[model samples]
Target chain A: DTTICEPFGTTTIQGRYVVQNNRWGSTAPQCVTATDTGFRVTQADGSAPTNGAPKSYPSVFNGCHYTNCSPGTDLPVRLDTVSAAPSSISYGFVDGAVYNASYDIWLDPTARTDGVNQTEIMIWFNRVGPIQPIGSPVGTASVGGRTWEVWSGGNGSNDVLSFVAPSAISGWSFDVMDFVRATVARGLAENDWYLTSVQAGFEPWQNGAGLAVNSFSSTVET
Target chain B: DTTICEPFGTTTIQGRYVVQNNRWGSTAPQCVTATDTGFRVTQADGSAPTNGAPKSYPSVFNGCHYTNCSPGTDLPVRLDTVSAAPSSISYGFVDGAVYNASYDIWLDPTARTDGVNQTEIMIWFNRVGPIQPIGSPVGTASVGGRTWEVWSGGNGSNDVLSFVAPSAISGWSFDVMDFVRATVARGLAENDWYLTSVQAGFEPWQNGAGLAVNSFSSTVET
Candidate 1:
């Protein structure tokens, strides 16, 4: 899996993750899941890399800027498979972590709420091996609610899974609902001997990160 | 703690369920949680119920019938207010075995597949206790297949829930998805205390069978 785009300006970020290792007695696959740690923001716009950023912000009025926001592989998002089968999956980007990101991007003419967004577009890979069982969506909301929609992509060769977030969200934001589902799917694939790679920082989510490369790769045992 | 209206032909079903003895400890209020159930039928007619007919038919083309339907009593479902409780609590119908004869009305239509007409409706329900989770829909073609949608109301209710077969299924007659979803929601409510009642059945579903009371009940010692 790889993130070719970074969240910046008006452009959107999209990504694809392949699940591996799905077979009998294996755990079910998850589409996406979150890890214990949040993204490690390296730098923010107008602010030195040493100083930390605030955690919360208003919906439409608040905005932060992140710069040179390169992410290391350790911070790779974690995903676990809860199901015991291997299948193809895919989806598109909707919004960043912020539901109001779109509003701040468009309605805010002066960009008053647009702060240096310091967020990382990362992905984690896992092969099913005794992970917990995660349930279905708690509730349904628009994709802009920062929830990544899970879809079925044709072909066993390349199953696509994608999520979108607001470019304006300061630091990093996420939808637990999407993260859990996707990670579980990935885990199921890995356990079934199908997961291929763990790539982080996909395309269009760089958000002015000076790094030329957009992804970091890793491996996991099924 | 009552099933206010006759379940036949109604779109909504509400009920209350109580938690019996707890293996861990005991608590108060006796009505902590409530169950609620709702149904959305795809009746042959896209309209609501008439003077006596249900608003919508069970998605199943045909299997059951809602004949001589009438409004019923507002019986107490159950009540339990304990918190941090375990899942081993036992439950029973409030009104005792007499509640068996009490019937609710529903509609089911005959489905036509290829050249054969068959019975069966797409049904759903909640309140399958001893297991907080519910089973995935079980039937043939979700759209035009044949299968029984059964719910044991709850582990305690033991109400053998099912969708009757359609009588005139031919030329690919099938049940709608919405109807199934609505039925399951009600089944869940049959076991919860927060819910008021539960209504489930067919929509545009021919020969509806409204709330044919079940024989299952729960019993636990305090």
Candidate 2:
């Protein structure tokens, strides 16, 4: 029953998740309401050109971010000590917006508590309008029981490995490590890297008021 | 998985709930592990005389306490504006402990965010051992489809109205306002008061390790 319009506004929910209104690119004014399970963009304005970055990334996460860690987290665990990262997500989409319903997985070389992690893995479940991942499509591979168009590149700030669905998917439950192990196979990340966060949100380049993360959950295992 | 031993240790779970080791009485060591849905008492020591206050109340709650409010809370809500407060709780009990698996509901004259409130309503779902609620039994009543021995009293600091189940109830989902209306009818509370928090856990008079709030959920409707 709370709404935040301020850029970078954050709150915790369900005991172990954090919601953030990360309108980093364009100050087009965006707001999100944190719900019991997920969040919905209540107001989103302005639009960047399709060639540039999205206006904002309003997300809900279950891990550490800049030392604002959720209680009782096993995050920042070395991949070698991890067996699985099981996650499930259901999304809400609107046709009027240019955005991607995505999940962001982060990893770092050190057990860092803050700042941008060294590597970013994105899984796009749904993409609306004419928008794409960070880099150009390099190849296609199967992971998490689906075929994907792979995109690999660095965002100047950090490396981004993207696995985009061939077609829009509404929801699914899969192990995030499926893509992480796949990245390790590509030699972009190693077994010793520390997994930093697991996030799901909408990166909107245009008005995205109705885009929502209907539900999300993530758990790590040894 | 984390174990907390601090007397007033607190942490968050899921994304919108708080877990507290509210060892406010005896200083004997006690610890609880905050888990995916609820908590389990990992260590419990010491005991208070059953006729007096319990040693401690280790609980998980949704709403504000001392201004430390959960995100997206509809709490501190006026009872008149609320239509229903649906809640469900599942408890884990241990035979060796003398305790009660309970749910606590709070109310205030003003929107008091800290300290004790004007009234506390406790539902004793499973009372183990020789312990009982504060004050003598006034009469018999039915709430949430079960017969209860209604007990009303105060701790000098605030008033308490409790409903004791005739037999152990492992779990159930019901509207809390049904009891609130009953309190209103009995002249103990009014519609003008504010509903502050919804909590579920154990109140231990003796060793209580292995007691658990297996799962809990509460939501208020307007």
Candidate 3:
């Protein structure tokens, strides 16, 4: 368990997840405090300019990303063979002037030792304010007992598939494999792609303060 | 002089440019009236629903875009070896609830009949809302006698270069070659790329009514 309260600060949690203060956008003056389970972010000032991209994505993540990984220190299990990889997060409290609470999962076709992942899957629980996904709505689907609006687009060389809930779901519990299978069935992704990483956090665009993640847990059962 | 007031309405102007009432996004129910030199748009009912992406890009454009081009266009000459290509747009009146006034320029490495292009250049004269650009600010330059913040990024496979004015400029006069040369100098674009099309328009997000482009014109000299 560790706590970080600075821009771009990072630390490992329970040897299973890494919490990061990823303030990758322009508007600055933000801070993040990581706890044992999750973290809290407070954006004092400086909002993202309205062109679209968010200001920061303070998150907790696991699996492989270029080099960072869990306690095993190796890449997570492949996507196709994973049996039941159930994950859940309970937001005991979340306060933000404007932001989106979601999970950003990455996958790739090859196991390269670089920061290049070809596929990005986003499961958005809530999106506040006037933000839109990357691409247009291609279709909709019922997965994990919920209906989701699907959006498809490309960022640089990678493909992005976003499953946005019709309405906000504060607390979420589901098997990530189910969504992956649905995507494969829809011809949006390949079955052989490897699950590279799983990240969950908030994307704050403006006046985002007093945001907190109460608890988060994930495991892979082969 | 020509005036068009309808969704997807189109008209040829000045025997060179084509004005379009392109309501391409969701929550439409909008209209546009085009004059000989420019046009006016009114979103009577639907405003873009707080999503960052605009609903439509009603514009005036020239050059080759798939099949849209001037009569006997023969294409607008290549990017390299172009001495001075001066362009200007006068906003005799612009009254929008929220929007951005910009010029979307397209280029390609090789000539092809399909609609694919390799590069996109955006020059923002006025951004009325909280919008931001695609990528980070790479550098600053004085082009066309005005200072601009240069940003570079990619969408899927193509490159994007944005020269954003420090502040809003309603009436714009600049040599398009200067900005193109600056981009080439930064190694973000190739000198031999071919110019595909130049489109000037407004991206209204919400409550955009009574937005008008008074007059617009451009030319290239080899």
Candidate 4:
């Protein structure tokens, strides 16, 4: 068990996952406790104005993140070579907080293990209070037996394709390739791109305590 | 996935576990969303004063609870015949809540799997706000390499032996027998008693919307 409060603190779990405190948006105090299977928010002390970026992206990940990769992660695998990517995630949400409980997938044209990817895939499992994705609604589509309101845009540095659910979803077991293909079909990513990392956590505009990635697992099959 | 709002609603998950909204103490609105692996509090609209019982025990568990057994569960096994019981749980917590997140173990002198048991073993993982276990602090001792403040008392009909942590424990992978052995040493339980259900959740007094048992697993080996 480890408690991380450093601005960019990171710790590994079960020798196969990495929990990180990517608190780059604000200087307000925030902390996470890493456990055997996942991580939980212990102290979330600041809020960012919704008009700007949320305070931070505190998450548990299953692949490479900013040069730090999970143990034996099969990531940075080219999307063209990927056969399937099965992933499962369970989220814990709270009240009086404005945030989006999200599962993230990062893709790039190169197989670099460090830094930001060129494209981001955001899966909005649940959102509390007032907030929106990177862009406006492009429309709706069916993916993995569920209909999602799609939002497409970028954060100036990377293209983001988001699948926003109509209602909050507590958890799910699904194929990551399904969303990857959906993004490919929408012209945001291509088959030659490399899948860099997979993550789940919260993007908070206000009080973010209690938002958690109860459990997360990802397997890349080729 | 099902969202249960009825105060006493219960739902089975993956055919091996049950998620229940045992909102027995107050008429306050509370709800739980049972997922593929566990559950989360969706809406907790009210509270109970800390002077008495909590407003609810929204939890997920393995084995028979009030005669509703999990699919093919091997619970109600006599302690002397049981070799080991390994369990894992992850929790999510929130602020503005008066609550104690606990893991519960039930035992009975007979093999009955319904209703209340003769003894209850409580593991207090974390307590938010002003709240304590069902008795006065007796003393402190070590279990599983961690020292805990032990509390002992009888809740009239049943006996309760609680082990409270000095600080919060987010989650862990441990053997149920460790705490059981501790209780047995305290003279509250015997080797002939039957180990019934194992559960983890929140005993919330107020504002419990985000508190959750992020994940839970229990296995009894004989």
Candidate 5:
């Protein structure tokens, strides 16, 4: 429905989602163009100094942080009471280049006085090239009707938890709350925290010229 | 009178300061060597991107974070009643590549419950490339016996206040508290925050080989 064709570009789709060319890391991407449906990014031919840090994260997302929500919105959705029908997402990822196709979710145990989330949860459906999750795999869990390996770590003042599938799932359908509930039951996350954002993107380290999302959709019960 | 010749290397000197090769960014530095006195970091020529994010912070520092005081050390000095003698710093930086010679100081209004500071104050003496401070110049002030432009912003949840010198001060001496006091006077900072660390280093954007700190020394009065 929309098209974005610039570095650090952004656009709103259907007045409910935000698709961004978020070049927030090292090595400025060469030509990053995004459409309402998805995006395509081109990096330089060579690689960055393989330090495990990603070069750029181009993503599509829906939530309070950047989508339908205003500049300052207090997202107070408690995890225990989420709707099953609308708390799910389905997407078709057309993969190109070396990267990791993942979903980055943010939450806060308490509303921030300074507008910062305290927890980050990531679900990795696919990975290419020499890449690894933030921390070691803590254990295995079955969620979203699939088995995943979980990892946990910290980034400064925030906690990071990651769930990675053993194999890449290109066209996927899953209830995201299944993962959230599993994390809560494991005592890894609190049930009262606010779900702030759910973002799907690619972390491109090397030549990622033609990566894209062919289709994507999500629903959040208000 | 110390030298450390490794990546992620560290050394202690004068029973007060710790010199470290903190390569915390995206690019993996090729050969980073440090000393109790200074450091020299060479990136992979023709490979590293010359973006604003730094590749390494080879620094000499003291106080709670990097030296004697570990986590949860009750830093007792109030900013209003700080002495002039041990609050000064003298340093000499050898120019080699594109980087910023700056001092990074940390503070917390309340002692950290999870080992994280709430405030980060930066004093930039010199910059070689197209690098600006965190935020826009909020205003200007006279500190360290010189005029400096002040910038205020936040890094996630914490507050960041930067005092940037008008021009490069290669070999310089100044009382660090003068800048801290100026920030407090402007209501940008509070006096009750615990002084956590005072770190001086060079942030190399690219081609930062042969860069060295000729000499550096600082004091913290408890």
Candidate 6:
């Protein structure tokens, strides 16, 4: 048997480019450690180096560039960090029957230096038959650091909502996944929505953001 | 119009009968209070009481004579309290797919009393579908003052158990209309079984006496 090796792409370990794990069973590559910055990569190896790469003289890792770096159109980047949007979501059906299920998304203009702060919310239904759309995104007051967008829908039977925090950066992320399961009908509330498998995200902000999204899937009856 | 009334032929509430409102927008039937081993019956006639009977007495309300008492033989017979065989259960999936769920139903043989010594252990899997018969029934045990028969089944895809009480007494009743949902592949177990709208009965011990037989209906997935 023969093996092939190639120069894979690079990713920001701390603030420097490092070899990405493109090989099977390959461990995550490490970068040179930087004093001010977490870590940096000046050279590429299979593994991380003992010493971190030194920052370019007088250059600080600010935002996504070196100091005095051009093309800094504020970097149209979305951070799913301290501020983010509702990304992925799931729905479930528990004990009894649910006639309908729904959800709401809130956006705070103030929370995002570069994002929409509209109160308009989106709703989805875990239905099998026809697709029924909810009303246009409705506007609402700012809540939980940002404006809220409400989303709701159901199968007119047992319904559940499991949402994943979106990748876009907003101001705050709400476990609107469960909000739909909690509100709609008084009987739609549940207990297992707080399990550890609920919310999943890459940013540390969403690690335990006091928000919960149930991991349940539901369907509408014929 | 002519409305003739007869003493012996008049409606009697001497027994335990569910009282329900007959007119439009009426309410549920009220349980008539029993005193001196007898109950009162009110006539539909909105007339003077002197024209008809006010009340009547049936067999007797004493403990020994279970006259109008609830039918203990009915599967819907309420249990003062019910407990499971295993205090806790563990499950796992063979793969990441949701189709390989499986669970174990441990028997303590000490949770509930069939009326005798707390030796007859049972593991019931009511409200089941996607179920499969497992091993043959074990043996019968006595707990408290009652005798119980135990049985378990599952073909690695589904599992269930039954603990038949010795006698269909007030405290021990397993009617014919109880079921549970068991998903061997999903490791999901649910007892969504409900009382039948119509009256039904569990079979007498198939063997009768100390030697009784109990047969369960086989359910298949459509």
RMSD of each: 21.2, 21.5, 19.8, 17.0, 23.2, 24.8
**Residues B1-222, candidate 5, lDDT per residue (tens digit)?**
444545566666555566676666645544545444554454423223454456667776665653345223234345544432133344444455667788887776754334657777898888877777776788765553355688988756677898888888766544555556556765666876666677787777766666666666665433
Model 4 chain B: which ten-residue window has the lowest total lDDT? Answer: B139-148
lDDT of 6 at A162: 26
Instruction: Please provide TM-scores, in order, for all candidate models, with all chains considered together.
Output: 0.22, 0.50, 0.48, 0.51, 0.45, 0.16
Compute the lDDT of residue B155 as modeled in candidate 6.
33
Would you list the C-alpha lDDT of every candidate in the order shown?
0.21, 0.84, 0.70, 0.84, 0.62, 0.22
DockQ score of each predicted structure, in the order shown: 0.02, 0.01, 0.01, 0.01, 0.01, 0.01
Candidate 6 per-residue C-alpha lDDT over B77-170 given as tens digits, one digit per residue, 9 for 90 to 100: 1222211111111211111111111112221123211222211112332211222223465665322212335556543423445544433221
lDDT of 4 at A36: 82
Tell me the docking grade of candidate 1: incorrect
**Model 1: per-residue Cα lDDT over B97-130, one tens digit each:** 1101111212122211122111222233222112
- lDDT for model 6 comes to 0.22
lDDT of 3 at A109: 76
Candidate 2 docking DockQ: 0.01
- What ranking emerges by TM-score with the best candidate at the front? 4, 2, 3, 5, 1, 6
Clashes of each: 172, 16, 8, 0, 1, 67
Where is model 1 more than 4 Å wrong at Cα?
A: A1-38, A44-82, A85-193, A198-222, B1-4, B7-9, B12-222
**Residue-wise C-alpha lDDT for candidate 3, range B64-138, written one tens digit per residue:** 765667554435568765544556687633555677788877777775434767777889888777776666788
Off by over 4 Å in 2: B1-222
- Specify the poorest-scoring 10-residue window by lDDT in model 5 chain B: B81-90
